[PDB]
Design a protein around this nucleic acid. Structure first.
Lengths: 216, 109, 4, 34, 225, 124, 128, 62
RNA sequence: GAGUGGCGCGGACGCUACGCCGCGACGAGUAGGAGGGCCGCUGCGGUGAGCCUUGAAGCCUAGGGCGCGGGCCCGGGUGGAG
RNA sequence: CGCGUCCCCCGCGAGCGCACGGGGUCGGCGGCGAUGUCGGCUACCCACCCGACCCGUCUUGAAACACGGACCAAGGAGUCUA
């Protein structure tokens, strides 16, 4: 028994401890922490009893096999990957969707979801886009923000909620959660003037427009 | 509604003088005329869009006649704002002096 | 021995 | 293995020096208010 | 009985572990000593130059012991005396590097392969960079990368050079077993100079990039390493 | 002896079948069916062989007896195993391990036996 | 479906075209079959820029992917059903190719035997 | 791009007996193992001599 | 290293040793020299319980492939005895 | 960072976990699908950019205003004996 105290020394730089191993001996106080020195489960049967084995041997062997691999270290599965946000992607930043069906549409960013996909909502009243996911590298984070400091996004909408089950029909849950969240964002966009019509408008490249000069 | 790609004139091949290397392509993106104006376009996706005789399936809807060779801006090339790109199969030489599309969507803004 |  | 020690000492020494330089600039800002 | 047998094997394994920890500690404390040796070496010449200038006299320092030699020209159209000296230095390829210690014998060998080499007096940093990044040993006449200290310790154990910091110390401060530590190091396969040369063919003094580049060799080491 | 009459039949045997950079041997007791000093069914004193049965169903495990080896009419003991897949292979593993009779041919004999049983099993 | 091989590595080839003989373009007497040119002035021989390439050992394919069919198997050439039980245990990496001059009535026995043994045939439905 | 003469890159001694004599070939098999797996120099000398031509392993008189 | 005193019946691949495997450096070439050819041609001794009138050799081919190459193997057609 | 002991001064604790650690993995996804489309590099025809003089031979030096070669098939030149 013993409650695990979180790492006694902080991290100065990645892989480097703040305190050396003389400091750390005193920090952990080891001067008063010194130490000295299944297979076949039986079954009753209606001329005696029998000994069965859960995990009993295979009935078929293939004519040729592949051997086991070598062992590597830094090869994590996707669930355990460290997730980045680009610094400009601030919850409330007005993105420009670039790739899919809703390309060129300006859309309010809500929050970074658990899998690194941006949960994003251009209000369905304005843009005709739902509570939809997007990717960071397929948007443009504009220098246009509104204060989303207070309002509570439902927690049950997550990366498992948005996954395609397998024509598609909009559930009543989706429509309630849409007008639930959007009822709290619409007064924030209708506060700052000319901003609802700006979201309703579509981004495009003109003649004499080069993106390397425009601040957006 | 409107356009979502900068216009790159395919200038010609990566080459010396008496020896051209067809694996790399030299792009001239319109507007950008320096090496300190072409940091934005490094890593972006490029498309040589053309149309040919037969029908070829389209990702998103109906089989059309239109076709693509997807590329990728790798480097800046020389002092006056040209760009090295590299395509999944080598570009055809009939395309020299023709339009290809610089996309935005390995986006860094 | 001097760990004990 | 002494590399870890040298790197840690270098980062700490640079941090302290920067703090002292920032404090000197703060003293200059005090003097320019005076 | 076997209780005894595995107990003995466990003891012999633990004995091998504590022998590793004892050697490892020696590597740490020798690196801490060499750090202290280098800083007092560095301070001394600034002290001696100051006390000289205070009196109003001059301090001519020690003429340097260590040279780094880079071959800049290739294999085609080369004299037989220039060939023999270049392969006595082990610069058998364009952009190969070796350390050679300066005496009377080696300088009169350098000045007769002069237009084919660009050499000078290296820095502690350059000696660190070359032996850590491009460090390969001549173990069983095979060019093997110095990834561990058990290569250097197993080869140069007799001369008390048991780690990379020992190797770098014996190279930099031209010691006793420079010969057996320099001949251990396989000649350094450097890249092409990034930024280009000035001019290959002519001397450093007359614009070019051949002959003796006294303290300026460290800049060429950065661009080729 | 084994190594002696290997050096005679390694390149110049009736059974040797070289083509397409591949070398097999069509020997009546070779299992894995390839030109080797191990799997050769004629060389050795001890030999294990797995065949399909005289009829459709079952396998036949062939054990070359120790005693008389210039005596080819009595040299081989044939037994048949028409059981389920697991109990067929278990009998072979108990014939090869628990007699200490070519323990290096144990796994190769179980793979061959399994292939014979999978062969005489109908297609959908 | 298909009888899939035990491993599918992607069979990378250094060259795909043939090594056509020098001046096989012009003459009908000159075959396409390769012959190293030994003429004292020959452009191809002394490797001029933009001439016909000569084969080297450098062009050699990977030892893992050598003689491997597009599918991933390796061929064995078979005349009768006595030459299939050879392939029985070499099943997942090797496949049978029934020879040119095997009669119809024998192909209908080899493929109906190889179907039982689960061995792939590269030309299964030839004559019928 | 390195100045080596390749004249003397190959070594011209025997790695195996030219003879297709099987009994000699089994002795060579037997002594390759002992040359490899002992710190005896005798087995290395005997193995090397088993390769040599009749004009190089002459008849010793009684 | 070795002695005498103080339940469960289990464990991949391998090793044509003329084979399989590991690490390092290298690779222009006429006359010329050597090696390796599972490159090819025609006949003899062995051998494949080889192939073949349910179609052998030969020949043609925008067919499918293999080999660094010499070359080769399948598909379709023609042909009629090896 | 134990004292029970060897100087001149003043020999086997126990676990669990994270990883800049002896060479890449996902416990991540998204489309399109039966005479109108998917794949097929090599191979038939064509176009475009770059490169690109016609072989053999004697010669210091051959694309040569040096000689042999219109085109195709079969034959055709280091052999045997001492």
């Amino acid at each position: 028994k013993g409650k695990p105290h979180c790492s006694r020394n902080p991290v100065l730089v990645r892989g480097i401890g703040r305190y050396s191993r003389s400091a750390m001996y005193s920090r952990k106080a080891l001067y008063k922490r010194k130490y000295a020195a299944l297979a076949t489960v039986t079954k009753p049967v209606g001329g005696g009893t029998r000994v069965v084995k859960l995990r009993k041997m295979p009935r078929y062997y293939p004519t040729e096999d592949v051997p086991r691999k070598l062992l590597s270290h830094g090869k994590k599965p996707f669930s355990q990957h460290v997730r980045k946000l680009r610094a400009s992607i601030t919850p409330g930043t007005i993105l420009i969707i670039l790739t899919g069906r809703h390309r060129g549409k300006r859309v309010v960013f809500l929050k970074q979801l658990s899998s690194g996909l941006l949960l994003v909502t251009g209000p369905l009243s304005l843009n005709r886009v739902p509570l939809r996911r997007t990717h960071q590298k397929f948007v443009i984070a504009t220098s246009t923000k509104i204060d989303i400091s207070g309002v509570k996004i439902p927690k049950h909408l997550t990366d498992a909620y948005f996954k395609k089950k397998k024509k598609y029909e909009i559930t009543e849950q989706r429509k309630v959660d849409q007008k639930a969240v959007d009822s709290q964002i619409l007064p924030k966009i209708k506060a700052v003037p000319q901003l609802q019509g700006y979201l309703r408008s579509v981004f495009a490249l003109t003649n004499g427009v080069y993106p390397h000069k425009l601040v957006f | 509604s409107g356009r979502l790609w900068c216009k790159a004139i395919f200038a010609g091949y990566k080459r010396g003088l008496r020896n051209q290397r067809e694996h790399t392509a030299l792009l001239k993106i319109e507007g950008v005329y320096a090496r300190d104006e072409t940091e934005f376009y490094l890593g972006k996706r490029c498309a040589y869009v053309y149309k040919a005789k037969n029908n070829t399936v389209t990702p998103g809807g109906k089989p059309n006649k239109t076709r693509v060779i997807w590329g990728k801006v790798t480097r800046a090339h020389g002092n006056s704002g040209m760009v090295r790109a590299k395509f999944r199969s080598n570009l055809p030489a009939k395309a020299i002096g023709h339009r290809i599309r610089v996309m935005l969507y390995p986006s860094r803004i | 021995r001097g760990l004990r | 293995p002494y590399a870890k020690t040298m790197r840690r000492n270098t980062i700490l020494r640079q941090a302290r020096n920067h703090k002292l330089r920032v404090e000197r600039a703060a003293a200059a800002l005090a003097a320019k208010s005076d | 009985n076997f209780a005894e047998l595995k107990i003995k094997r466990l003891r012999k394994k633990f004995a091998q572990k504590m022998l590793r920890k004892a050697r490892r500690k020696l590597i740490y404390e020798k690196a801490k000593h060499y750090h202290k040796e280098y800083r007092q070496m560095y301070r001394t010449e600034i002290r001696m130059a100051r006390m000289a200038r205070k009196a109003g006299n001059f301090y001519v320092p020690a003429e340097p012991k260590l040279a780094f030699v880079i071959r800049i020209r290739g294999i085609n159209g080369v004299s037989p005396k220039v060939r023999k000296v270049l392969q006595l230095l082990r610069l058998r390829q364009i952009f190969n590097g070796t350390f050679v210690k300066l005496n009377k014998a080696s300088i009169n060998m350098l000045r007769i392969v002069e237009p084919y080499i660009a050499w000078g007096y290296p820095n502690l940093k350059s000696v660190n960079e070359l032996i850590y990044k491009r460090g390969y040993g001549k173990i069983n006449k095979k060019r093997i990368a110095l990834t561990d200290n058990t290569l250097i310790a197993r080869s140069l154990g007799k001369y008390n050079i048991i780690c990379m910091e020992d190797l770098i110390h014996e190279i930099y401060t031209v010691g006793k077993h420079f010969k057996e530590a320099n001949n251990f190091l396989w000649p350094f396969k450097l890249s092409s100079p990034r930024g280009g040369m000035k001019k290959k063919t002519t001397h450093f003094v007359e614009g070019g990039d051949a002959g003796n580049r006294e303290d300026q060799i460290n800049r060429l080491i950065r661009r080729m390493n | 002896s084994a190594h002696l009459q290997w050096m005679v039949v390694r390149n110049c045997s009736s059974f040797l079948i070289k083509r397409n950079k591949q070398t097999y041997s069509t020997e009546p007791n070779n299992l894995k069916a390839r030109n080797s000093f191990r799997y050769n069914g004629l060389i050795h004193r001890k030999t294990v062989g797995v065949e399909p049965a005289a009829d459709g169903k079952g396998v036949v495990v062939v054990m070359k007896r120790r005693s008389g080896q210039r005596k080819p009419a009595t040299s081989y003991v044939r037994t048949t195993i028409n059981k389920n897949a697991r109990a067929t292979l278990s009998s072979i593993r108990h014939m090869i391990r628990k007699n200490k009779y070519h323990p290096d041919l144990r796994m190769a004999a179980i793979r061959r036996a399994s292939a014979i049983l999978r062969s005489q099993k109908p297609v959908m | 479906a298909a009888l899939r091989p035990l491993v599918k590595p992607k069979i990378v080839k250094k060259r795909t075209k043939k090594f056509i003989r020098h001046q096989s373009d012009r003459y009908v007497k000159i075959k396409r079959n390769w012959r190293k040119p030994r003429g004292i002035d020959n452009r191809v021989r002394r490797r001029f820029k933009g001439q016909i390439l000569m084969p080297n050992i450098g062009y050699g394919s990977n030892k893992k992917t050598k003689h491997m069919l597009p599918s991933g198997f390796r061929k064995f050439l078979v005349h009768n059903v006595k030459e299939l039980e050879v392939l029985l245990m070499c099943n997942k990496s090797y496949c049978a190719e029934i020879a040119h001059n095997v009669s119809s009535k024998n192909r209908k026995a080899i493929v109906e035997r190889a179907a039982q043994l689960a061995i792939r045939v590269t030309n299964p439905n030839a004559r019928l | 791009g390195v100045d080596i003469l390749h004249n003397k890159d190959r070594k011209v001694w025997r790695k195996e007996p030219k003879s297709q004599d099987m009994y000699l070939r089994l002795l060579v098999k037997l002594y390759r193992f002992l040359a490899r797996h002992t710190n005896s120099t005798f087995n290395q000398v005997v193995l090397k001599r088993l390769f040599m031509s009749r004009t190089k392993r002459p008849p010793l008189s009684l």
